[PDB]
Symmetry: C3
Subunit: 227 residues, 3 copies
């Protein structure tokens, strides 16, 4: 009878996973769907399903049904990261030069695996969104106070380029803009949200105003969230 009890529970787990490393579910949204009660917390979801042993630790915003992958590493430290030699200041790709590109998900799993689980969510979600902060000292993120212009605004590489202005479908929005005046380290917050998830996540960033001897910046990278 004990064996029967063990089997039945096991079977129930199969019909509905419970989010644990041992019993992951397809998206946070389903976990939400099949486990209405469960509260937002770290949960294990396996987007490509099939084998269960390659799921990923995501954060479920169990309110929205969003699945949110923290990006590793999470942050880029504060430093005066670039030279200021040209009178003209030009866009630079952090990851491409000096710099690393942002990686998303479990460090442990191989590239080809982190690609495909991400690929499914990214290919098959209703929409995706991602937030990113630019810490600044003496460095214009988006709006230049003195020009009242975005010419200085930075760029982001969706995977596709996200700019302040240009085709609307590819323009990030700003959520706050601390870094608009030069004088003595403040934060700007950007956001990209779309129905073509394939466009996310943000892998690289390009600050236009940079390399001043005065100029220093850091970043922290918010999770890419699929719904």
């Amino acid at each position: 009878m004990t064996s029967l009890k063990s089997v039945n529970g096991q079977i129930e787990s199969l019909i509905s996973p419970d989010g644990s490393r041992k019993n992951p579910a397809r998206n946070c949204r389903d976990l939400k769907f099949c486990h209405p009660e469960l509260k937002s917390g770290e949960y294990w979801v396996d987007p490509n399903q099939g084998c269960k042993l390659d799921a990923i630790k995501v954060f479920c915003n169990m309110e929205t049904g969003e699945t949110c992958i923290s990006a590793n590493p999470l942050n880029v430290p504060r430093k005066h990261w670039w030279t200021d030699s040209s009178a003209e200041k030009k866009h630079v790709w952090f990851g491409e030069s000096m710099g690393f590109q942002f990686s998303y998900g479990n460090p442990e799993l191989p590239e080809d695996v982190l690609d495909v689980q991400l690929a499914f969510l990214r290919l098959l979600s209703s929409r995706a969104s991602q937030q990113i902060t630019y810490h600044c000292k003496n460095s214009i993120a988006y709006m230049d106070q003195a020009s009242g212009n975005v010419k200085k605004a930075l760029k982001l590489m969706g995977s596709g380029e996200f700019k302040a202005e240009g085709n609307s479908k590819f323009t990030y929005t700003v959520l706050e803009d601390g870094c608009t005046k030069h004088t003595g380290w403040s934060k700007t917050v950007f956001e990209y949200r779309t129905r073509k998830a394939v466009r996310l996540p943000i892998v690289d960033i390009a600050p236009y105003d940079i390399g001043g001897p005065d100029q220093e910046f850091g970043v922290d990278v918010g999770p890419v969230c699929f719904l």
Copy 2:
């Protein structure tokens, strides 16, 4: 022993779903594949699989293996829906103006969910096809009798534009053409069929000849069928 009997049946259901709200399958085509006998009828299929509680009531053409989603609402009523003021007559988007866009699947399920189940079928099916009727009084659908021309022909928004003429890959075909002469309410039937399912379903419609005081029309929207 009764418990064992209940488990075994339960397990069998898992290996093969039977199409019911409680035990849905991935596509009508599989239901057809794993249940060769079952006759065309309303059945419950769950394209994104995973959680079972968000499947959709489709029609299975169990002959073809097509999965056919009736679109809600099904029809647009007969009415003289638009003004005729310009000497020139121009294309108008029903949904965009005066008008609503066609929604597909369960009313009950959320947008983000109806998106993703549709997205999978739509992204991953061999081909899709959809039929649409234009009821008419004193209104040219496709072929103008007097010109022997399609200039008057209408348009449809695949999601992409489907026109009578233009790039071949994006031209609808006509299955019958009642509305070719003005004089005292007849039906034309259009069809789009493709291997890039992503292009369907039809969400919006644009009649070129419209708004005459004389002019009146209705529509009924056939299901979007995936194979």
Copy 3:
């Protein structure tokens, strides 16, 4: 107790498939993941999952986790397949003229089914690669000895065109080049590898230097391999 034993094994099979026609798994890579030990060999994988009865016999390179579909038919025989009348020699599509296009997977399964299993793997894999050999007598594959040029090089239809030169993202690489001198039947080997798997497999081939009375060629088509 025997029934319980049968159920438990059955359940275990469900959690992890074992690659057999009866118990297939999603990709060779998972089979590799959930069955680390299993050696490279013919195995049964079912990419669209759902119903189990429509899987496909693939080769698992259980070292790489690649899933490799042998293409049917495997080879095109040696023959002087084309006319040489024009002083100018021009590209010809074997399949399009004189010729057949390459089909991949189980002969038994219907087109719409072989499409969708391939579609998933092809849509959802980390990368794909495919190798193809051009047997030659008196026929330049890629490099012309006398010109030291690729002008004569052939083409391949990815599904998209793969050429010796052109946009880099769409250029095949050569792995060996036997057919560079005219005089009395040697082999060249081509390869396309990409992260946009949608581009593969190779369905058609176009030799630029062909139809000489002297000129004869065969092909054998290597499998399209998904990872």
